[PDB]
Amino acid sequence: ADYQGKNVVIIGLGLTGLSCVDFFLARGVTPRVMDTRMTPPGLDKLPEAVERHTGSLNDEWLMAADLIVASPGIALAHPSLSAAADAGIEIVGDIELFCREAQAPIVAITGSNGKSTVTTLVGEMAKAAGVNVGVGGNIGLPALMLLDDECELYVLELSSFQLETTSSLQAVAATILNVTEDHMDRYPFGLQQYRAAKLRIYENAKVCVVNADDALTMPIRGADERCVSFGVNMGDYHLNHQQGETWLRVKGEKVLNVKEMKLSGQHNYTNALAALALADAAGLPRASSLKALTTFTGLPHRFEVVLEHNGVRWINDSKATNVGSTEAALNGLHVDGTLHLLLGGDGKSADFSPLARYLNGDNVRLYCFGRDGAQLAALRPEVAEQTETMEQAMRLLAPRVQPGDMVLLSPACASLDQFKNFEQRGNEFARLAKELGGH
Numbered sequence: 197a198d199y200q201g202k203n204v205v206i207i208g209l210g211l212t213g214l215s216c217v218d219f220f221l222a223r224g225v226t227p228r229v230m231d232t233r234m235t236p237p238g239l240d241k242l243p244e245a246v247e248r249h250t251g252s253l254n255d256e257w258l259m260a261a262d263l264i265v266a267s268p269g270i271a272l273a274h275p276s277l278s279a280a281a282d283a284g285i286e287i288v289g290d291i292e293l294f295c296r297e298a299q300a301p302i303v304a305i306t307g308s309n310g311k312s313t314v315t316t317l318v319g320e321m322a323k324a325a326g327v328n329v330g331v332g333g334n335i336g337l338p339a340l341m342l343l344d345d346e347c348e349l350y351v352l353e354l355s356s357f358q359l360e361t362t363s364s365l366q367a368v369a370a371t372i373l374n375v376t377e378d379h380m381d382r383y384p385f386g387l388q389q390y391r392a393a394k395l396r397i398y399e400n401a402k403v404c405v406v407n408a409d410d411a412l413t414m415p416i417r418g419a420d421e422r423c424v425s426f427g428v429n430m431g432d433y434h435l436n437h438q439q440g441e442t443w444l445r446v447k448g449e450k451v452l453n454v455k456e457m458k459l460s461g462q463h464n465y466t467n468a469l470a471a472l473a474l475a476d477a478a479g480l481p482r483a484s485s486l487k488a489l490t491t492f493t494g495l496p497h498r499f500e501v502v503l504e505h506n507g508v509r510w511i512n513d514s515k516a517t518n519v520g521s522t523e524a525a526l527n528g529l530h531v532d533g534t535l536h537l538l539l540g541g542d543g544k545s546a547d548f549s550p551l552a553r554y555l556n557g558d559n560v561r562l563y564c565f566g567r568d569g570a571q572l573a574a575l576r577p578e579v580a581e582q583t584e585t586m587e588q589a590m591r592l593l594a595p596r597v598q599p600g601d602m603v604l605l606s607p608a609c610a611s612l613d614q615f616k617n618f619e620q621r622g623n624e625f626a627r628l629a630k631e632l633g634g635h
């Protein structure tokens with residue numbers, strides 16, 4: 197694409213917006229940047245030559261633009277951005293800018309849960325085959341920073357927000373892993389509007405990898421000749437549960453006994469199936485892809501044991517930012533004593549009621565904090581405490597922890613009401629777990 201001489205306006209002074217500033221400046225185009233927040237996090241990292249506007253969107257700049265580049269955190273429905281769209285001004289995101297430049301095949305992964313795990317697994321499968329791979333997107337490395345003439349494969353984690361502003365993605369293989377309620381504060385037409393955003397990932401994809409157990413993952417006009425499926429008891433890629441033993445199978449053939457994996461849990465076995473299906477579709481050798489499933493140890497903040505001491509496990513699942521993710525932590529969870537569950541933050545208008553069925557019985561205590569703490573404590577008030585902060589909650593629960601207990605941060609909410617990012621939340625939990633749970 198050619199941006200020379202164009203009036204380019206970037207919305208959002210966070211990670212994405214800064215990556216876009218650098219992208220345009222490296223091509224000789226000086227953009228302008230705006231953000232609705234008075235003091236956005238990237239403000240002090242912005243090059244001195246770039247004009248900036250904070251505290252609101254600037255309609256003089258938007259209506260003058262030839263190209264608007266919207267960070268995923270700004271809604272297209274914002275009245276100023278909707279007005280620019282009504283005037284026919286082109287609006288794209290960083291993923292669109294990336295797709296217009298990329299010169300290697302793209303594997304594209306979305307879904308409500310499991311995206312970073314599957315994205316990282318496909319990257320590891322590529323590395324095991326000796327492929328120069330770039331892994332990024334919503335996982336936290338902005339995609340424009342991956343562009344490299346020597347890269348042989350890109351693996352992108354994509355959010356619904358990023359997909360809304362993307363029109364030129366033609367993935368070699370694309371998946372929606374699952375669709376469960378999230379981001380409802382951004383989707384006022386509800387679950388099907390959120391789904392519609394994700395369904396964009398399949399447009400012009402060579403192979404679509406769908407979840408046979410989740411009908412909302414199937415393409416917009418229905419499953420077609422491009423579609424390969426994964427699932428538990430059915431699918432092209434599926435599981436088989438022998439006597440105390442689980443295998444990954446592909447079209448009637450065993451490929452891996454999951455005892456060789458370092459991850460566990462049925463949802464991680466279906467994540468492994470989805471990753472294998474994507475890698476197969478990208479042409480990666482099966483043997484090296486299977487090897488990578490056995491070496492991958494998991495990601496920080498995803499059901500991460502940060503301390504095991506005195507018979508207590510302290511588990512950082514800060515990446516559980518929606519109900520479905522916390523459900524995956526609780527479903528089938530084994531705790532010898534009491535589960536001390538930390539819930540809270542920015543609930544994004546979620547209905548938390550699906551969690552209540554996991555919170556019965558005599559061995560569960562809730563510690564609820566942040567913006568929506570009260571709504572979480574209402575799941576079962578008789579076992580719940582509410583604090584302002586996670587630190588207060590941890591200092592409250594720590595004296596009550598007995599050998600055999602589990603302390604689980606799986607908050608079902610985003611972190612931005614009180615933290616810079618979910619990593620800061622998990623890191624603070626880990627620091628407090630070490631202080632309160634160790635000698």
Ligand SMILES: CC(=O)N[C@H]1[C@@H](OP(=O)(O)OP(=O)(O)OC[C@H]2O[C@@H](n3ccc(=O)[nH]c3=O)[C@H](O)[C@@H]2O)O[C@H](CO)[C@@H](O)[C@@H]1O[C@H](C)C(=O)N[C@@H](C)C(=O)O
Pocket residue numbers: 207208209210211212213230231232233267268269270333334335336337338339355356357517612
């Ligand atoms: C909210 C979102 O989409 N965040 C992703 C984004 O990070 P970045 O720092 O660029 O975010 P952003 O677009 O600046 O938005 C962050 C926050 O700033 C707020 N914001 C942003 C712009 C603005 O003018 N005003 C404003 O108030 C947004 O409402 C949002 O709450 O780009 C990064 C690189 O692609 C992603 O790693 C990061 O994923 C984070 C982990 C995330 O929470 N993603 C969501 C979608 C999710 O996983 O559920």
Ligand SMILES: Nc1ncnc2c1ncn2[C@@H]1O[C@H](COP(=O)(O)OP(=O)(O)NP(=O)(O)O)[C@@H](O)[C@H]1O
Pocket residue numbers: 307308309310311312313314373374463464466467498499513515516517518520521522524525
């Ligand atoms: N298939 C799955 N279904 C449900 N939850 C999952 C699945 N895979 C992983 N998780 C959980 O989802 C959370 C995040 O995992 P990750 O692989 O980072 O997914 P994400 O899509 O990048 N983020 P999120 O939207 O919070 O799941 C963790 O709490 C995982 O335990």
Ligand SMILES: [Cl-]
Pocket residue numbers: 197198199200223
């Ligand atoms: Cl250019």
Ligand SMILES: [Cl-]
Pocket residue numbers: 436437443445450
């Ligand atoms: Cl079998």
Ligand SMILES: [Cl-]
Pocket residue numbers: 517609610611612617618
């Ligand atoms: Cl967050």
Ligand SMILES: [Mg+2]
Pocket residue numbers: 308355378379
């Ligand atoms: Mg999300």
